[PDB]
Amino acid sequence: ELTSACKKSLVRIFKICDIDGDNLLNDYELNLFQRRCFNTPLQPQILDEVKAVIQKNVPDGIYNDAVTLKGFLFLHCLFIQRGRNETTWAVLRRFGYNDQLEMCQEYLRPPLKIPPGSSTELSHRGQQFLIAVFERYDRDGDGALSPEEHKMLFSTCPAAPWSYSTDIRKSCPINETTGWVTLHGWLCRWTLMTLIDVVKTMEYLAYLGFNVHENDSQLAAIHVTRERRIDLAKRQSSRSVYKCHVIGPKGSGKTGMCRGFLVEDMHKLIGKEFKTNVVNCINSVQVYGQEKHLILRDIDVRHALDPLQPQEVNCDVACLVYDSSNPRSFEYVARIYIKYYAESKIPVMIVGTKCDMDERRQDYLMQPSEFCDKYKLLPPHLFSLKTNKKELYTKLATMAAFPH
Ligand SMILES: N[C@@H](CCO)C(=O)O
Ligand code: NA
The missing domain is CATH 1.10.238.10 (EF-hand)
Structure with missing residues (x-):
């Protein structure tokens, strides 16, 4: 019946x-x-x-x-x-x-007008709900979701908002022992989606029953933030999610750098090949006593003469990565900073990878250290996976969160 x-x-x-x-x-x-x-x-x-x-x-x-x-x-x-x-x-x-x-439209996709310059973040209620949902499907009580528990969680949805094995497990902090997505990585993946695809976030929040649990529209899960000059306002709206476009030439090792943001033990990726294309990696870093999320977008590598789109150029902080151990590598970074970032307002960080091998001279006119000196940039950040140092990730977010 x-x-x-x-x-x-x-x-x-x-x-x-x-x-x-x-x-x-x-x-x-x-x-x-x-x-x-x-x-x-x-x-x-x-x-x-x-x-x-x-x-x-x-x-x-x-x-x-x-x-x-x-x-x-x-x-x-x-x-x-x-x-x-x-x-x-x-x-x-x-x-x-x-x-x-069927699922109603205005129930899934309520109107939300976001002015240019403003970003979309998860509100306090939105996070609390996502944490609450996470625990109901964490049967082992170890603060981690298995691939089976992940499917169970989105069983109330037409499909998963992302892959488990080819997305959230490679782009977000997981557990080292088990290999499963932690509670931290759970909120991270949602933070990423909320920033770049707020409509999809709200649509999946309704499916999970945010509207019913909170007795409100899923607008209450989205917090619109914006960088703003001092207006002495009552309720402040400072950004907490910054997007960093990592742009570099081929074989510049800029991929392994992004993956290292997700693990404490970085000396397991020294000579690792990445047979998985992760567009956006995300983790959090403390910036002056506050939690800040940084999104490292692995911009598609290409020829130096190949063009670059505004949606690839425009970001919160640009991380130009070259190979210090390769003489024909830094030319790309030099070519791109001039064409796109020289007259831009975006903070830029030059990064030299593989300092644990042999510092080779760059066949380009100027050396990397000299290039930064000319265009008034910080000296090329020496980076390697053997050192396990994560000062760079904290530095990148601090550049995005501040002038100039
Ligand atoms: N469907 C329940 C109430 C909502 O869960 C009932 O009418 O018994
Ligand atoms: Na119950």
Whole structure:
């Protein structure tokens, strides 16, 4: 008696209402989500009468005064019969379903106008929800999601917002022992998505039941920030997520640099080949007592004569990487800083990779140290994976967060 489409909708609602991930709807959530749908508290005897019907008609449907999925599916399968289908509908309606039993548009994609210069970040409520969701699907209680638990978490979605093995595991901080995405990396991946694709973030937040849990639009999960001159405002809006475009020639080792931002032990990537193209890597660094997220975009390598798009040039801080151990490498960095960043307002950092081998002279006119001196840049940051030093990542974020 239950539609195949109706069961698909009801099973998602059960998962969202399952605030413990214990496959049960205990007394608290039943009363909580009662107010979400009907604006009234669940009356004690009504719940008792509901439980009596379930335990009678269907086995393994009630486990310790808590409605199981089967008993929950049956209960609504009952409602549509006895003439009160508007009770089932009011529930489906609150979780963003229309009459054709599809997810509504204005429920998934509410209007959000972002002025140029402004960035989109996760608000406090948005983070709290994402942390809460993370723990319900972390069964081992070790602060990490397995690939199986990751799929379970997005089972209420049409599909995952990203790959587990080819995205979040290579672009975000994971656990060294297990290899699974940590709570930290979880918030990191969402932070990345929120910044560059706010619409997709909100769409996936509704699927996870942010609108119902918070009793508000998913606009309350998005915090619009902007760099602004002093206006003596009450509520400050300073940025916390900075994007860094890493631009360099081929074989300049700028890929292994980005991956090193995600692990403490960097001496496991000395001679590692990356058979996986990660566009954006992300982690956090402390900048003057505050947590700041830095996104390292591995800009596609190309010929020096090949052009560069504004969406590839414009960023918060530009990191130009060359090979100090290669004489025909620095020419690229010199060519690009002049063409795109010489008259730009973007802070630029020149980075010399592989200092643990042999400092070779650059066949270019000026040397890297001389180039920075001329255009008033900081001396070429010596970088290597053997040293395990992460001062560069802290320095990059500090350049983006500050003048000039
Ligand atoms: N669907 C539940 C309330 C919302 O979870 C019920 O009517 O019993
Ligand atoms: Na529960």
